[PDB]
Each structure stands twice: as structure tokens, then as C-alpha cells.
Design a protein around this ligand. Structure first.
Ligand code: CA
Length: 298
């Protein structure tokens, strides 16, 4: 379970879920030939584990070009289960009909697919959010289903936003709302709940750290609580996912510590353990070479 956990490919922008006693881990595959130009990402890979230490590779689960309305760029994504189906929210570069990055959604009958575009068009297009002129604000989706059954889509670079999702998971319900209270917000929202607190962690500043805020409701208000993760080894992007599995908590992220020539466009998923303080704040992550111990259900 030494970090990075996969040595034969470069993996980035991790997301994870727990389904029938296995963790499923989703990540973009970095195919950039070096760290000199830009991200080259075409497909997302799927892995699974019953102990957080030994991982089964399932191969590509989805490709950016699977969305007929996308140019490419298999950017940050997240998968969630509802009512027996799996909804995969993706960042992709939209074709020129609606210039800029966008958020798509695919649907699958199992955690490993087969996945297909659930809409045949984008869920969020760049032109739906014009309070900033940049064309990469509509990236990095995070999805959450609250205890009352209301689902929510969070996203954004520069401008943090969320909206309710309909029960079908593929349609917005009501207004796109701006989120307040996240100082130095950059991108990469992850939302989770533990006991009676909600947590919104995010990439903060640039080069990126991870900051986080706590709320008593999924609607906020969000109260900033400080740095969750220092700048990650040899990468300016710091992209995280937090899950609870078998009575432990896991901070899944990426570094540029892989070989050969890991770096900003050739990243590697890593995992370390996450610990709560009694008051529900989170101890700052310690990023390690050793990673996590096996934690299989007895
Ligand atoms: Ca926009």
C-alpha cells in the first residue's frame, strides 16, 4: 500500500465510493508525455478493493469522447450510487457549439459500468454561469445525497457553486447558487458528512493546498476551519476525495511523485488516513510514503 498506489500508469483527480463492502476508485489517466506542455487526458480508469491496500484494476470505465458533444479532456469527476444505478459526473471540454469546459453525466448499472451519457448533452454548459468570463469555471463536480433524500451538485473553479439535483440525478432542480465563506477557493470541491457535521473541502490557492469548511447543513453556512492538506509532492494541483470505510476514514489524493518523470501533468493517486478531533475538526493530513494498512472486514 506504499504511495503512489499504482506504478504502471499515471492517475489523477481521484473519486471513490463504497458499494456492497468494496471501495470503488475512479481516476483520470494522465497521458502527457512530459511535464512541459499540458494535461493530456482521454479516459477514466476504475479500481476496487475490499481492504484499501490491495487494488483490482478494472480498466477504462468511460472516455471523454463517449460524450458526443465533447471535444475531449477527461477531467475531474465523481461517481455516486442511487436506487441501483451509478451516476458519473464528469468535467470535459465541450465542442465549439457551447465553448468552454462543461459538466456531463453518465449512468451505469454497476460500479464498473457499462457507462453511457445519460442526457446526450451537457448537464452544465459554460454559458449557464457568466459571473466570471473564464471558460474553465464549470469544472470539478461533486455530488451529495443528504439524509432527507435531496441530492446536490457542487462545482466550480474560481467561483464555488451548487444546485439541487432532481431524484433522476441528471437534471437541476431550481437555482444555481453561489457559495460563501471559502477563502482562497480555487477548485476541487468535495462534500461529505460525518456524524452531525457537513464538510466542504477544496483546493485552495495556487500552487494548491486543501482547505476545508464545516457546516451544520448541506446549504451552509460554511465556516472555514483551516488547511487540511499541505501542497502535495511535486504537483501544483491538489485534488482530494474523502470516504469512510470499515470504521476508518481515508484521504485519497494525487501527487507528482511517480516514475518515470512524475510531475504536474503526470500524476499518481495516493491514499493516507484521515482522523477527526473530538469536536469534529479534522487533523491536518500527514502525506506519507508508507500509506495505509489493510482494513478488511472480519
Ligand atoms: Ca461559466
Amino acid at each position: 500500500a506504499e504511495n503512489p498506489i499504482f506504478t504502471d500508469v499515471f492517475t489523477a483527480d481521484p473519486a471513490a465510493l463504497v458499494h456492497k463492502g468494496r471501495v470503488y476508485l475512479y481516476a483520470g489517466r494522465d497521458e502527457a508525455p512530459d511535464n512541459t506542455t499540458f494535461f493530456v487526458m482521454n479516459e477514466w480508469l476504475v479500481y476496487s478493493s475490499d481492504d484499501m491496500a490491495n487494488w483490482e484494476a478494472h480498466g477504462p470505465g468511460l472516455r471523454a469522447k463517449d460524450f458526443t458533444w465533447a471535444k475531449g479532456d477527461a477531467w475531474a469527476s465523481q461517481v455516486i450510487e442511487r436506487n441501483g444505478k451509478f451516476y458519473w459526473y464528469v468535467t470535459v471540454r465541450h465542442d465549439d457549439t457551447k465553448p468552454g469546459f462543461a459538466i456531463g453525466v453518465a449512468v451505469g448499472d454497476s460500479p464498473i459500468g457499462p457507462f453511457k451519457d445519460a442526457l446526450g448533452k451537457a448537464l452544465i454548459t459554460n454559458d449557464m454561469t457568466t459571473d466570471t468570463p473564464i471558460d474553465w469555471d464549470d469544472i470539478d463536480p461533486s455530488v451529495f445525497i443528504d439524509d432527507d433524500g435531496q441530492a446536490y451538485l457542487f462545482w466550480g473553479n474560481t467561483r464555488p457553486r451548487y444546485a439541487k439535483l432532481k431524484k433522476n440525478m441528471v437534471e437541476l432542480d431550481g437555482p444555481i447558487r453561489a457559495i460563501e465563506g471559502l477563502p482562497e477557493f480555487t477548485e476541487a470541491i468535495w462534500v461529505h458528512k460525518y456524524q452531525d457535521n457537513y464538510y466542504l473541502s477544496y483546493a485552495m490557492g495556487f500552487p494548491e493546498k486543501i482547505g476545508y469548511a464545516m457546516g451544520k447543513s448541506i446549504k451552509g453556512p460554511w465556516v472555514y476551519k483551516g488547511i487540511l492538506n499541505e501542497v502535495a509532492g511535486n504537483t501544483p494541483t491538489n485534488h482530494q476525495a474523502i470516504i469512510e470505510f470499515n470504521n476508518k476514514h481515508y484521504f485519497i489524493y494525487h501527487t507528482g511523485a511517480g516514475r518515470p518523470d512524475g510531475g504536474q501533468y503526470r500524476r499518481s493517486v495516493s491514499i493516507d488516513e484521515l482522523f477527526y478531533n473530538p469536536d469534529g475538526t479534522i487533523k491536518r493530513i500527514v502525506m506519507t510514503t508508507e500509506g495505509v494498512a489493510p482494513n478488511k472486514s472480519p
